[PDB]
Design a protein around this ligand. Sequence first.
Ligand SMILES: CC(=O)N1CCN(Cc2cccc(C)c2)c2ccccc21
Length: 113
Amino acid sequence: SSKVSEQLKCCSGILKEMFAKKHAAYAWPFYKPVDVEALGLHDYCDIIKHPMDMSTIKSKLEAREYRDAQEFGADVRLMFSNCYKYNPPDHEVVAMARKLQDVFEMRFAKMPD
Ligand SMILES: CC(=O)N1CCN(Cc2cccc(C)c2)c2ccccc21
């Protein structure tokens, strides 16, 4: 029963939506950590210093590792920025990231006061 605890509940709701069937078409690459053993991803860890994904953010929320919504937000944006940094700007996964980020940014912006 506080301002910060209510906003963190909203964050959990936002992430739940991101995991929903509704967005699955473009959200799926962000579900689990980038598999750096996959062909073509041998250099991922050379380029991406701080990997992030939605399962990791979910575990961090559930282990209460986010002091506030801004910290949760930073991890969501890290995930997207990693995608934009690593992949070629014309790769389909970049388009998918933008589609999911549009969902996130709209919900995050309209979090209650
Ligand atoms: C999020 C991210 O940077 N990557 C790396 C590129 N990809 C590879 C890839 C290949 C075809 C279609 C798509 C949408 C994606 C990928 C795949 C599964 C999980 C993560 C990623």
